[PDB]
């Protein structure tokens, strides 16, 4: 009944389906070896299936599903640890997925390659952000932005900037902060002050 569940999934409804307007559908299922909704990549409509997933520890595993455990949703997948050596992991995928469809083997090798490349890229990126020290933070929220705009308007109104500058300059002129014979003002102006 692989074909019947495929017809039900593909032509009626699937909860793992992302329909895009750009010419491709995507599979939201975590065990999909390629995140695409097509006949060969369906983890549900294929009784024998294989995928490659990476644990939060960083260890990458190969997951194999057979027809004889298909009525056992808690026992669907057997998990096999893949080696850190890339070539040895490729040969492990070749050995465990012997006599499988060539599509599943090919996509498993591609997914393992992409996961190792993403791990290397992640290490390089983490080193670069550790060296630079930059970090993205959110901007001000609209309520906080409106608050700062209104209170800055009120503070600018209450500042009286030019009057304050003129008053402080005249105050500095009175108390002799510029010294005798000030270079700032005319001699008649300094005469009037005294």
């Amino acid at each position: 009944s692989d074909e019947i569940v495929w017809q039900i999934i593909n032509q009626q409804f699937c909860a793992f389906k992302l329909k895009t307007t750009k010419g491709q559908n995507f599979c939201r299922n975590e065990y999909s070896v390629s995140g695409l909704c097509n006949r060969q990549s369906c983890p549900l409509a294929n009784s024998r299936y294989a995928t490659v997933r990476q644990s939060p520890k960083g260890t990458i595993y190969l997951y194999i599903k057979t027809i004889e455990r298909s009525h056992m949703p808690s026992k669907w997948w057997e998990k096999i640890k893949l080696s850190q050596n890339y070539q040895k992991a490729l040969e492990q995928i070749d050995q465990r997925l012997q006599f499988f469809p060539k599509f599943l083997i090919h996509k498993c090798k591609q997914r393992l390659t992409r996961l190792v490349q993403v791990a290397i890229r992640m290490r390089r990126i983490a080193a670069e952000e550790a060296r630079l020290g930059e970090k993205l933070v959110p901007k001000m929220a609209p309520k906080i932005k409106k608050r700062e705009e209104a209170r800055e308007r009120k503070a600018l109104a209450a500042a009286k900037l030019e009057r304050t500058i003129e008053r402080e300059l005249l105050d500095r002129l009175r108390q002799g902060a510029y010294g005798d014979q000030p270079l700032n003002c005319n001699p008649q102006i300094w005469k009037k002050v005294l």
Binding site: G23, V118, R121, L136, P138
Partner: protein, 131 residues
């Protein structure tokens, strides 16, 4: 080397939009295209010097349809799980964060997409750099 895929050159047969006839004169007429249905309408009869109508001959190449000038196709993302779906399609698709995604979720999406090697079109959204 990280870019889009090798693709055939992007050719747009027409860059302008098809405006509705007499929509520049009346404010009650939107510029969205409406096919003229009058018998003596010279736009419908295709007289010289008039508006062209949209035809299937104006269609884009199937190898470069829906493709941005960078070569990627836009993929709308609402959360981190959505950018994870582009693990195997980092060279064919670019992430477009949805307009109603908050700032912290945007930071989560941008960080993960950089690690996955997926371009983000609107990465200059409501975020800023702290030293």
């Amino acid at each position: 080397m990280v870019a889009a895929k090798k693709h055939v050159p992007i050719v747009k047969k027409r860059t302008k939009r098809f405006m509705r006839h007499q929509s520049d004169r009346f404010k009650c007429l939107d510029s969205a295209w409406r096919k003229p249905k009058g018998i003596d309408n010279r736009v419908r009869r295709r007289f010289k010097g008039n508006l062209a109508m949209p035809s299937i001959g104006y269609g884009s190449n199937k190898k470069t349809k829906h493709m941005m000038p960078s070569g990627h196709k836009a993929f709308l993302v609402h959360n981190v799980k959505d950018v994870e779906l582009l693990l195997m399609h980092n060279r064919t698709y670019a992430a477009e964060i949805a307009h109603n995604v908050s700032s912290r979720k945007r930071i989560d999406i941008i960080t993960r997409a950089k690690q996955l090697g997926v371009k983000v079109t609107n990465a200059k959204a409501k975020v800023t750099t702290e030293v």
